[PDB]
Amino acid sequence: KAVSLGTSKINYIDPRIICSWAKAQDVPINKIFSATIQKKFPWAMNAENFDF
Amino acid sequence: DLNWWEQENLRIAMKGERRWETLAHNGVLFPPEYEPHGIPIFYDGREFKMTPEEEEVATMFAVMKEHDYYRMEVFRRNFFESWREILDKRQHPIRRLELCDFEPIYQWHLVQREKKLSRTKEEKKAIKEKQDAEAEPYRYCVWDGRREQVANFRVEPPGLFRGRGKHPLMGKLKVRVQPEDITINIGETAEVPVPPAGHKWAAVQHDHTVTWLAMWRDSVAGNMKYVMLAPSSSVKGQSDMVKFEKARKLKDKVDDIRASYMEDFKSNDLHVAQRAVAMYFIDRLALRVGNEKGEDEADTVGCCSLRVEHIQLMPDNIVRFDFLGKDSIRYQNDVAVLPEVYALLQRFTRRKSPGMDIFDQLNPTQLNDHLKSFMDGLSAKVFRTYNASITLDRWFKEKPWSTADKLAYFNKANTEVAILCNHQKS
DNA sequence: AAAAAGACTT
DNA sequence: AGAAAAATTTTT
DNA sequence: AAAAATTTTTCTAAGTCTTTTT
């Protein structure tokens, strides 16, 4: 059995944490969230200097 | 005409409150009726013919020949009991699974799988095109005037129950859902989905306090199943944000909760002291709360249901945890605990046999009620959301390259979150 | 109070 | 929640 | 072009937790 990274990203991590860091380090969203999980989190996409 | 998260001062409705004003949808997509192949089996060497109903259930098992389930005794036993309930309606010689030879059906299945694999690219497009036509009236609903995707509109087909871990009902038949099994939830003024010709719905209701479009009761254990909206829908999104907003509100209440349970460590009330260690575990280790399970379920535990056998007290204030949790995923961890918690754990286990509960005077209800005293809506699952999110935040903030190198850095911060949560893939 | 139903997340 | 199917990309 | 590996999506089981019933 291996460590599974999907469950935490899908259910557990505030997606605004991921989106903030990805815009502040100029990493494209598409290399972290697939098309489907981007459509899950549209309220988080705009990713502004976010402090959880 | 804004989106709902650019809205100024919107009130997001909570569970059990009024959730919608209007709801329109087309109901559910039923799998195709069973098509018999008329292939016999052989029982004790003699050919045996089956009704379509017997044959369908025989085929379910036969087809699973290369799967680990097929060789498990509990699975085989539960299948055979299910199959015999059907067979026993008429006269037949079937008495022992060992004497049943499913090979003609298995071989039929291998021929059908080969025929499916060896269709042309144009043949597999005219098949994908015909099915997506069929699903199209069901993929969407209209919730308060907005079009939303529906997630699980395809009714579960019948099958042999695939229980995780050591599930006592693995192999049991999950029967075909009929229209008569399904309750439709829709708006009072909406067009009601038409049941298949000759059938009716269980009931049609108009409950504005729920978010589901249809419901049936599953035959394995009587578990209620629901057709609900896709995660892209606004009802899912809004409850999803509200969820993360409570984890953030916990962040600010956390210190006060810890000072509270650390005072409870010294309690002479046994419930209170147990409650304290449980909330210590849920806080520091992000355990699930662990509700009691029935005799017809796999034996798995979370916090409140840990037994003496699940912990081992080691030399230097170290607790070794070893237990199956949700999904029968093993949790293995050596944890250095507060000396006051380690001593309490010695008290909680001293003369007890391995199968006895550690927190015998604590249930999830008592724990979650106590938590409401610190913050509205606070419950044990919230610490898990809090722990996962705060772990990523902290890592970004105290451990700050190529676009690919910065991703490996992400993967590693994600991996730390997944380890804490004990998320595993085989 | 305790157990079951019920609806929602993971 | 993880398993499995299905889709897509990488290797050959 | 095929095969292999890898990621993504679909599927439904398995939890949590509040409300309702006894």
Short mmCIF file of all heavy atoms in Angstrom, two decimals, chain E:
data_model
loop_
_atom_site.label_atom_id
_atom_site.label_comp_id
_atom_site.label_asym_id
_atom_site.label_seq_id
_atom_site.Cartn_x
_atom_site.Cartn_y
_atom_site.Cartn_z
"O5'" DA E 1 0.96 3.71 -36.41
"C5'" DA E 1 1.11 2.50 -37.13
"C4'" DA E 1 1.21 1.30 -36.20
"O4'" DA E 1 2.16 1.54 -35.13
"C3'" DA E 1 -0.06 0.89 -35.48
"O3'" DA E 1 0.03 -0.56 -35.40
"C2'" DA E 1 0.06 1.67 -34.15
"C1'" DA E 1 1.56 1.66 -33.84
N9 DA E 1 2.21 2.84 -33.22
C8 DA E 1 1.85 4.16 -33.30
N7 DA E 1 2.65 4.99 -32.66
C5 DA E 1 3.62 4.16 -32.13
C6 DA E 1 4.76 4.43 -31.35
N6 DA E 1 5.11 5.66 -30.97
N1 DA E 1 5.52 3.39 -30.97
C2 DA E 1 5.16 2.15 -31.36
N3 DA E 1 4.11 1.76 -32.11
C4 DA E 1 3.37 2.83 -32.46
P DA E 2 -1.12 -1.57 -34.87
OP1 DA E 2 -1.37 -2.59 -35.91
OP2 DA E 2 -2.23 -0.75 -34.30
"O5'" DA E 2 -0.33 -2.31 -33.68
"C5'" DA E 2 0.33 -1.44 -32.81
"C4'" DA E 2 1.15 -2.13 -31.75
"O4'" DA E 2 2.03 -1.13 -31.16
"C3'" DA E 2 0.28 -2.65 -30.61
"O3'" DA E 2 0.93 -3.82 -30.11
"C2'" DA E 2 0.22 -1.45 -29.66
"C1'" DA E 2 1.56 -0.73 -29.88
N9 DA E 2 1.56 0.75 -29.75
C8 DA E 2 0.65 1.64 -30.25
N7 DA E 2 0.92 2.91 -29.95
C5 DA E 2 2.09 2.84 -29.22
C6 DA E 2 2.89 3.84 -28.64
N6 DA E 2 2.63 5.15 -28.69
N1 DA E 2 3.99 3.43 -27.98
C2 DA E 2 4.27 2.12 -27.92
N3 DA E 2 3.59 1.09 -28.43
C4 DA E 2 2.50 1.53 -29.09
P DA E 3 0.47 -4.58 -28.77
OP1 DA E 3 1.02 -5.95 -28.81
OP2 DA E 3 -0.99 -4.38 -28.55
"O5'" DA E 3 1.28 -3.72 -27.69
"C5'" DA E 3 2.69 -3.89 -27.63
"C4'" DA E 3 3.22 -3.22 -26.39
"O4'" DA E 3 3.05 -1.78 -26.49
"C3'" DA E 3 2.53 -3.65 -25.10
"O3'" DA E 3 3.60 -3.92 -24.19
"C2'" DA E 3 1.66 -2.45 -24.71
"C1'" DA E 3 2.43 -1.28 -25.32
N9 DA E 3 1.67 -0.07 -25.68
C8 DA E 3 0.48 0.02 -26.37
N7 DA E 3 0.07 1.26 -26.54
C5 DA E 3 1.06 2.03 -25.94
C6 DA E 3 1.24 3.42 -25.79
N6 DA E 3 0.36 4.32 -26.25
N1 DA E 3 2.35 3.87 -25.14
C2 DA E 3 3.23 2.96 -24.68
N3 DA E 3 3.17 1.63 -24.77
C4 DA E 3 2.06 1.22 -25.41
P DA E 4 3.39 -4.52 -22.71
OP1 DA E 4 4.54 -5.42 -22.44
OP2 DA E 4 1.99 -5.00 -22.57
"O5'" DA E 4 3.60 -3.17 -21.87
"C5'" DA E 4 4.80 -2.45 -22.08
"C4'" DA E 4 4.73 -1.18 -21.26
"O4'" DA E 4 3.87 -0.23 -21.90
"C3'" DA E 4 4.17 -1.38 -19.85
"O3'" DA E 4 5.16 -0.89 -18.98
"C2'" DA E 4 2.90 -0.54 -19.81
"C1'" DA E 4 3.13 0.47 -20.92
N9 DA E 4 1.90 0.94 -21.59
C8 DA E 4 0.94 0.14 -22.14
N7 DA E 4 -0.05 0.81 -22.69
C5 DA E 4 0.32 2.13 -22.49
C6 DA E 4 -0.30 3.32 -22.86
N6 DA E 4 -1.47 3.31 -23.52
N1 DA E 4 0.29 4.49 -22.51
C2 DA E 4 1.46 4.46 -21.85
N3 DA E 4 2.15 3.38 -21.46
C4 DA E 4 1.52 2.24 -21.82
P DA E 5 5.18 -1.24 -17.43
OP1 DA E 5 6.29 -2.22 -17.28
OP2 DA E 5 3.81 -1.64 -16.99
"O5'" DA E 5 5.54 0.20 -16.78
"C5'" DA E 5 5.79 1.35 -17.62
"C4'" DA E 5 4.96 2.61 -17.35
"O4'" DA E 5 3.75 2.68 -18.15
"C3'" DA E 5 4.51 2.93 -15.92
"O3'" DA E 5 5.03 4.24 -15.65
"C2'" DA E 5 2.97 2.91 -15.99
"C1'" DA E 5 2.69 3.33 -17.44
N9 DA E 5 1.39 2.99 -18.07
C8 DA E 5 0.86 1.72 -18.24
N7 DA E 5 -0.31 1.68 -18.86
C5 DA E 5 -0.57 3.03 -19.13
C6 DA E 5 -1.66 3.65 -19.78
N6 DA E 5 -2.69 2.95 -20.28
N1 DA E 5 -1.65 5.00 -19.90
C2 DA E 5 -0.60 5.69 -19.39
N3 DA E 5 0.48 5.20 -18.77
C4 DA E 5 0.45 3.85 -18.66
P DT E 6 5.15 4.91 -14.18
OP1 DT E 6 6.38 5.75 -14.14
OP2 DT E 6 4.94 3.85 -13.16
"O5'" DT E 6 3.90 5.91 -14.19
"C5'" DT E 6 3.83 6.90 -15.22
"C4'" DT E 6 2.46 7.56 -15.19
"O4'" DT E 6 1.48 6.69 -15.80
"C3'" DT E 6 1.95 7.82 -13.78
"O3'" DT E 6 2.04 9.24 -13.57
"C2'" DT E 6 0.54 7.19 -13.72
"C1'" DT E 6 0.22 6.98 -15.21
N1 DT E 6 -0.73 5.87 -15.59
C2 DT E 6 -1.87 6.15 -16.29
O2 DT E 6 -2.19 7.28 -16.62
N3 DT E 6 -2.63 5.05 -16.62
C4 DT E 6 -2.37 3.72 -16.32
O4 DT E 6 -3.11 2.79 -16.65
C5 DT E 6 -1.15 3.51 -15.59
C7 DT E 6 -0.82 2.16 -14.99
C6 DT E 6 -0.41 4.57 -15.28
P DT E 7 1.23 10.03 -12.43
OP1 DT E 7 1.89 11.34 -12.21
OP2 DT E 7 1.01 9.09 -11.28
"O5'" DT E 7 -0.15 10.29 -13.19
"C5'" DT E 7 -0.24 11.30 -14.20
"C4'" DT E 7 -1.69 11.47 -14.60
"O4'" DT E 7 -2.27 10.16 -14.88
"C3'" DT E 7 -2.55 12.11 -13.51
"O3'" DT E 7 -3.34 13.08 -14.18
"C2'" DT E 7 -3.34 10.92 -12.93
"C1'" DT E 7 -3.49 10.00 -14.16
N1 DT E 7 -3.76 8.50 -13.99
C2 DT E 7 -4.81 7.98 -14.71
O2 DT E 7 -5.51 8.66 -15.42
N3 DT E 7 -5.01 6.63 -14.56
C4 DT E 7 -4.27 5.75 -13.79
O4 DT E 7 -4.55 4.55 -13.72
C5 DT E 7 -3.19 6.35 -13.05
C6 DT E 7 -2.98 7.68 -13.19
P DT E 8 -4.24 14.20 -13.46
OP1 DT E 8 -4.03 15.49 -14.17
OP2 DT E 8 -4.07 14.13 -11.98
"O5'" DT E 8 -5.73 13.73 -13.83
"C5'" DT E 8 -6.02 13.26 -15.13
"C4'" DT E 8 -7.40 12.63 -15.17
"O4'" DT E 8 -7.31 11.23 -14.84
"C3'" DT E 8 -8.40 13.25 -14.20
"O3'" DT E 8 -9.44 13.74 -15.04
"C2'" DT E 8 -8.79 12.12 -13.22
"C1'" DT E 8 -8.37 10.86 -13.95
N1 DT E 8 -7.90 9.62 -13.16
C2 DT E 8 -8.51 8.43 -13.47
O2 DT E 8 -9.42 8.33 -14.30
N3 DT E 8 -8.05 7.34 -12.78
C4 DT E 8 -7.06 7.31 -11.83
O4 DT E 8 -6.75 6.26 -11.28
C5 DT E 8 -6.43 8.59 -11.53
C6 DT E 8 -6.87 9.67 -12.22
P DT E 9 -10.73 14.55 -14.54
OP1 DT E 9 -11.02 15.58 -15.57
OP2 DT E 9 -10.54 14.97 -13.13
"O5'" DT E 9 -11.88 13.43 -14.62
"C5'" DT E 9 -11.87 12.44 -15.64
"C4'" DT E 9 -12.80 11.28 -15.32
"O4'" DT E 9 -12.09 10.29 -14.53
"C3'" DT E 9 -14.06 11.63 -14.53
"O3'" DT E 9 -15.21 11.23 -15.31
"C2'" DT E 9 -13.89 10.93 -13.16
"C1'" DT E 9 -12.91 9.81 -13.47
N1 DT E 9 -12.00 9.34 -12.35
C2 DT E 9 -11.94 7.97 -12.10
O2 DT E 9 -12.57 7.12 -12.72
N3 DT E 9 -11.07 7.62 -11.09
C4 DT E 9 -10.29 8.48 -10.33
O4 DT E 9 -9.56 8.06 -9.46
C5 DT E 9 -10.41 9.90 -10.63
C6 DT E 9 -11.24 10.25 -11.62
P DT E 10 -16.72 11.14 -14.75
OP1 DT E 10 -17.68 11.18 -15.89
OP2 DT E 10 -16.91 12.00 -13.57
"O5'" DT E 10 -16.59 9.62 -14.25
"C5'" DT E 10 -16.72 8.50 -15.16
"C4'" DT E 10 -16.97 7.24 -14.33
"O4'" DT E 10 -16.01 7.18 -13.25
"C3'" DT E 10 -18.33 7.16 -13.66
"O3'" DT E 10 -18.81 5.86 -13.95
"C2'" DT E 10 -18.05 7.41 -12.17
"C1'" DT E 10 -16.65 6.82 -12.04
N1 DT E 10 -15.69 7.27 -10.97
C2 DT E 10 -14.99 6.25 -10.32
O2 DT E 10 -15.13 5.05 -10.53
N3 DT E 10 -14.10 6.70 -9.38
C4 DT E 10 -13.83 8.00 -9.04
O4 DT E 10 -13.00 8.18 -8.16
C5 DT E 10 -14.57 9.04 -9.74
C6 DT E 10 -15.46 8.62 -10.68
P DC E 11 -20.32 5.44 -13.63
OP1 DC E 11 -20.76 4.46 -14.66
OP2 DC E 11 -21.11 6.66 -13.39
"O5'" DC E 11 -20.15 4.66 -12.21
"C5'" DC E 11 -19.44 3.42 -12.14
"C4'" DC E 11 -19.22 3.00 -10.71
"O4'" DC E 11 -18.30 3.93 -10.11
"C3'" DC E 11 -20.48 3.04 -9.84
"O3'" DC E 11 -20.91 1.69 -9.63
"C2'" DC E 11 -20.06 3.82 -8.57
"C1'" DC E 11 -18.54 3.93 -8.73
N1 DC E 11 -17.86 5.12 -8.13
C2 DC E 11 -16.85 4.84 -7.22
O2 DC E 11 -16.62 3.65 -6.99
N3 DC E 11 -16.20 5.85 -6.63
C4 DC E 11 -16.51 7.14 -6.92
N4 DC E 11 -15.80 8.09 -6.31
C5 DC E 11 -17.53 7.47 -7.85
C6 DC E 11 -18.18 6.43 -8.43
P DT E 12 -22.35 1.33 -9.05
OP1 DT E 12 -22.78 -0.03 -9.38
OP2 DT E 12 -23.24 2.48 -9.32
"O5'" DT E 12 -21.96 1.34 -7.51
"C5'" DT E 12 -21.12 0.31 -6.91
"C4'" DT E 12 -20.76 0.73 -5.50
"O4'" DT E 12 -19.95 1.92 -5.58
"C3'" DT E 12 -21.91 1.10 -4.55
"O3'" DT E 12 -21.58 0.65 -3.22
"C2'" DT E 12 -21.93 2.63 -4.54
"C1'" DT E 12 -20.42 2.79 -4.59
N1 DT E 12 -19.96 4.18 -4.67
C2 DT E 12 -18.75 4.49 -4.09
O2 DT E 12 -18.03 3.66 -3.56
N3 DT E 12 -18.44 5.83 -4.16
C4 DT E 12 -19.20 6.83 -4.72
O4 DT E 12 -18.84 8.00 -4.73
C5 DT E 12 -20.45 6.43 -5.30
C7 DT E 12 -21.31 7.41 -6.05
C6 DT E 12 -20.77 5.16 -5.23
P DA E 13 -22.23 -0.65 -2.61
OP1 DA E 13 -22.29 -1.73 -3.61
OP2 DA E 13 -23.44 -0.26 -1.91
"O5'" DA E 13 -21.13 -1.03 -1.49
"C5'" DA E 13 -19.76 -1.28 -1.83
"C4'" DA E 13 -18.88 -0.61 -0.80
"O4'" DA E 13 -18.74 0.81 -1.06
"C3'" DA E 13 -19.38 -0.70 0.64
"O3'" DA E 13 -18.27 -1.14 1.36
"C2'" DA E 13 -19.89 0.73 0.97
"C1'" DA E 13 -18.95 1.57 0.12
N9 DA E 13 -19.51 2.86 -0.29
C8 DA E 13 -20.68 3.01 -1.00
N7 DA E 13 -20.98 4.26 -1.24
C5 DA E 13 -19.92 4.97 -0.68
C6 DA E 13 -19.65 6.36 -0.60
N6 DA E 13 -20.43 7.29 -1.16
N1 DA E 13 -18.54 6.76 0.05
C2 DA E 13 -17.72 5.82 0.59
N3 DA E 13 -17.88 4.49 0.58
C4 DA E 13 -19.01 4.12 -0.07
P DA E 14 -18.31 -1.32 2.95
OP1 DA E 14 -17.30 -2.34 3.29
OP2 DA E 14 -19.69 -1.57 3.36
"O5'" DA E 14 -17.85 0.12 3.43
"C5'" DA E 14 -16.47 0.48 3.56
"C4'" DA E 14 -16.41 1.77 4.36
"O4'" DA E 14 -17.18 2.82 3.70
"C3'" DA E 14 -17.06 1.65 5.73
"O3'" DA E 14 -16.26 2.37 6.64
"C2'" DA E 14 -18.44 2.29 5.54
"C1'" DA E 14 -18.10 3.44 4.59
N9 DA E 14 -19.24 4.06 3.87
C8 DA E 14 -20.33 3.45 3.28
N7 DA E 14 -21.18 4.28 2.68
C5 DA E 14 -20.62 5.54 2.92
C6 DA E 14 -20.99 6.86 2.56
N6 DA E 14 -22.09 7.20 1.88
N1 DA E 14 -20.20 7.88 2.95
C2 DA E 14 -19.07 7.61 3.63
N3 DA E 14 -18.61 6.40 4.01
C4 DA E 14 -19.43 5.41 3.63
P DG E 15 -15.96 1.80 8.10
OP1 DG E 15 -14.73 1.02 8.05
OP2 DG E 15 -17.22 1.20 8.59
"O5'" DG E 15 -15.63 3.17 8.89
"C5'" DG E 15 -16.63 4.03 9.40
"C4'" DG E 15 -16.58 5.44 8.83
"O4'" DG E 15 -17.34 5.53 7.59
"C3'" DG E 15 -17.29 6.42 9.75
"O3'" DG E 15 -16.37 6.84 10.75
"C2'" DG E 15 -17.68 7.54 8.81
"C1'" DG E 15 -17.99 6.80 7.54
N9 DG E 15 -19.39 6.59 7.11
C8 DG E 15 -20.04 5.37 6.98
N7 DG E 15 -21.27 5.48 6.55
C5 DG E 15 -21.41 6.84 6.33
C6 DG E 15 -22.52 7.56 5.85
O6 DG E 15 -23.59 7.11 5.49
N1 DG E 15 -22.33 8.93 5.83
C2 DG E 15 -21.16 9.54 6.21
N2 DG E 15 -21.14 10.86 6.10
N3 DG E 15 -20.09 8.90 6.66
C4 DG E 15 -20.28 7.54 6.68
P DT E 16 -16.80 7.50 12.14
OP1 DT E 16 -15.53 7.72 12.85
OP2 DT E 16 -17.92 6.76 12.75
"O5'" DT E 16 -17.42 8.90 11.71
"C5'" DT E 16 -16.67 9.92 11.04
"C4'" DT E 16 -17.63 11.09 10.88
"O4'" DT E 16 -18.71 10.72 10.00
"C3'" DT E 16 -18.30 11.60 12.16
"O3'" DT E 16 -18.17 13.03 12.22
"C2'" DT E 16 -19.79 11.23 12.04
"C1'" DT E 16 -19.96 11.17 10.54
N1 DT E 16 -20.97 10.16 10.16
C2 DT E 16 -22.09 10.57 9.48
O2 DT E 16 -22.28 11.72 9.22
N3 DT E 16 -22.97 9.56 9.18
C4 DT E 16 -22.82 8.22 9.46
O4 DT E 16 -23.67 7.42 9.10
C5 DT E 16 -21.59 7.84 10.17
C7 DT E 16 -21.25 6.40 10.55
C6 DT E 16 -20.75 8.83 10.47
P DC E 17 -18.41 13.86 13.56
OP1 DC E 17 -17.67 15.13 13.39
OP2 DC E 17 -18.19 13.06 14.76
"O5'" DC E 17 -19.93 14.24 13.48
"C5'" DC E 17 -20.48 15.08 12.48
"C4'" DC E 17 -21.98 15.01 12.67
"O4'" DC E 17 -22.45 13.73 12.18
"C3'" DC E 17 -22.45 15.08 14.13
"O3'" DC E 17 -23.51 16.00 14.16
"C2'" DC E 17 -23.03 13.70 14.40
"C1'" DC E 17 -23.54 13.33 13.01
N1 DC E 17 -23.84 11.87 12.81
C2 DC E 17 -24.89 11.51 11.97
O2 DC E 17 -25.56 12.41 11.41
N3 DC E 17 -25.16 10.18 11.79
C4 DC E 17 -24.43 9.25 12.42
N4 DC E 17 -24.78 7.97 12.21
C5 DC E 17 -23.36 9.58 13.30
C6 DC E 17 -23.09 10.89 13.45
P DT E 18 -23.78 16.97 15.39
OP1 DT E 18 -22.75 18.00 15.40
OP2 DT E 18 -23.92 16.14 16.62
"O5'" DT E 18 -25.22 17.59 15.05
"C5'" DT E 18 -25.62 17.82 13.70
"C4'" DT E 18 -27.03 17.29 13.43
"O4'" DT E 18 -26.98 15.86 13.26
"C3'" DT E 18 -28.05 17.56 14.53
"O3'" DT E 18 -29.09 18.39 13.99
"C2'" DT E 18 -28.58 16.19 14.95
"C1'" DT E 18 -28.19 15.31 13.76
N1 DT E 18 -27.89 13.90 14.09
C2 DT E 18 -28.59 12.90 13.45
O2 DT E 18 -29.48 13.13 12.65
N3 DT E 18 -28.24 11.63 13.82
C4 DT E 18 -27.26 11.25 14.72
O4 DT E 18 -27.03 10.06 14.94
C5 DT E 18 -26.56 12.35 15.36
C7 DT E 18 -25.54 12.13 16.44
C6 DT E 18 -26.91 13.59 15.00
P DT E 19 -30.38 18.86 14.84
OP1 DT E 19 -30.63 20.25 14.38
OP2 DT E 19 -30.22 18.62 16.29
"O5'" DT E 19 -31.52 17.86 14.34
"C5'" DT E 19 -31.67 17.48 12.97
"C4'" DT E 19 -32.73 16.39 12.88
"O4'" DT E 19 -32.19 15.11 13.27
"C3'" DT E 19 -33.97 16.59 13.75
"O3'" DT E 19 -35.08 16.34 12.88
"C2'" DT E 19 -33.84 15.56 14.88
"C1'" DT E 19 -33.07 14.43 14.17
N1 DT E 19 -32.20 13.52 15.01
C2 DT E 19 -32.28 12.15 14.90
O2 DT E 19 -33.06 11.58 14.16
N3 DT E 19 -31.38 11.46 15.67
C4 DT E 19 -30.43 12.02 16.54
O4 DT E 19 -29.69 11.30 17.20
C5 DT E 19 -30.40 13.47 16.60
C7 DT E 19 -29.62 14.24 17.64
C6 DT E 19 -31.28 14.12 15.84
P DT E 20 -36.62 16.45 13.30
OP1 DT E 20 -37.34 16.90 12.10
OP2 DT E 20 -36.76 17.17 14.60
"O5'" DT E 20 -37.03 14.92 13.56
"C5'" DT E 20 -36.94 13.99 12.48
"C4'" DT E 20 -37.30 12.62 13.03
"O4'" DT E 20 -36.29 12.18 13.96
"C3'" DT E 20 -38.61 12.59 13.82
"O3'" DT E 20 -39.36 11.58 13.19
"C2'" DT E 20 -38.19 12.24 15.25
"C1'" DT E 20 -36.89 11.48 15.03
N1 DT E 20 -35.84 11.51 16.11
C2 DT E 20 -35.26 10.33 16.53
O2 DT E 20 -35.59 9.23 16.10
N3 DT E 20 -34.30 10.50 17.50
C4 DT E 20 -33.85 11.70 18.05
O4 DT E 20 -32.96 11.71 18.90
C5 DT E 20 -34.50 12.89 17.56
C7 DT E 20 -34.22 14.27 18.14
C6 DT E 20 -35.44 12.73 16.62
P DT E 21 -40.77 11.08 13.73
OP1 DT E 21 -41.57 10.80 12.53
OP2 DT E 21 -41.25 12.01 14.78
"O5'" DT E 21 -40.39 9.73 14.49
"C5'" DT E 21 -39.92 8.55 13.83
"C4'" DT E 21 -39.63 7.51 14.89
"O4'" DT E 21 -38.65 8.05 15.81
"C3'" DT E 21 -40.83 7.11 15.77
"O3'" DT E 21 -40.97 5.70 15.64
"C2'" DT E 21 -40.48 7.56 17.20
"C1'" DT E 21 -38.95 7.59 17.14
N1 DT E 21 -38.18 8.47 18.11
C2 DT E 21 -37.23 7.93 18.95
O2 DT E 21 -36.97 6.75 19.02
N3 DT E 21 -36.57 8.81 19.75
C4 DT E 21 -36.76 10.17 19.78
O4 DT E 21 -36.10 10.88 20.54
C5 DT E 21 -37.77 10.69 18.88
C7 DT E 21 -38.23 12.12 18.95
C6 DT E 21 -38.41 9.83 18.09
P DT E 22 -42.16 4.86 16.31
OP1 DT E 22 -42.40 3.67 15.46
OP2 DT E 22 -43.25 5.76 16.72
"O5'" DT E 22 -41.42 4.33 17.62
"C5'" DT E 22 -40.50 3.22 17.61
"C4'" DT E 22 -40.03 3.00 19.03
"O4'" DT E 22 -39.34 4.19 19.47
"C3'" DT E 22 -41.18 2.84 20.03
"O3'" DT E 22 -41.42 1.47 20.32
"C2'" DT E 22 -40.74 3.60 21.28
"C1'" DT E 22 -39.43 4.28 20.88
N1 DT E 22 -39.30 5.72 21.28
C2 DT E 22 -38.30 6.09 22.16
O2 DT E 22 -37.51 5.29 22.67
N3 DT E 22 -38.26 7.43 22.44
C4 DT E 22 -39.10 8.40 21.93
O4 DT E 22 -38.99 9.57 22.25
C5 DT E 22 -40.12 7.95 21.01
C7 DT E 22 -41.16 8.89 20.49
C6 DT E 22 -40.17 6.65 20.73
#
